[PDB]
């Protein structure tokens with residue numbers, strides 16, 4: 001069911017924060033553990049700020065904190081080009097339950113279209129289930145990221161789900177879960193943007209995990 | 213849309 005997939009997502013969601021060495025942590029959004037010490041996280045969380053690699057990355061797993069130098073996480077792309085969401089290996093994180101087999105297969109994508117879905121996410125660790133209207137797939141999606149200083153950058157990704165719904169700041173990194181029980185309520189991707197009552201999630205397929 |  002949607003709710004049981006949501007429970008598996010919930011258990012693998014951590015809060016992602018960034019800070020200067022010896023400074024306060026800025027808690028930015030969610031990251032989703034997928035297997036071993038690998039997580040999915042929107043790279044817009046960190047990559048547009050100056051000297052990201054000299055920062056400390058923080059992972060909050062239910063009030064137990066894990067930190068690491070940004071230079072010591074291994075970042076791997078989901079596919080060619082910029083997809084925002086990346087795979088991130090974090091050697092200091094406790095191993096995750098492997099939830100990769102619960103992600104949609106590329107070939108099954110059409111089966112989630114035109115059906116409801118649920119965004120399984122948090123706002124700074126408080127779990128929320130957000131209804132999303134019948135899904136469409138945008139071959140390219142563009143959204144605006146506001147940086148810390150106030151300036152903005154336009155981001156464009158390939159293959160992003162679009163659904164009607166109401167999101168809030170901090171919900172990025174949550175997982176979109178199909179209402180379709182015939183594909184076992186597959187995880188469809190990762191929430192990256194929202195506005196004007198529409199929610200956008202980057203498609204993540206099982207096949208993408210082959211990038212290790 | 214804004215990055216969320």
Ligand SMILES: *C[C@H](NC(=O)OCc1ccccc1)C(=O)O
Nearest residue numbers: 004005008097098099100101102
């Ligand atoms: C949610 C996970 N399920 C899983 O990996 O399914 C694989 C499977 C299940 C039944 C028949 C064939 C393959 C889990 O934690 O097990």
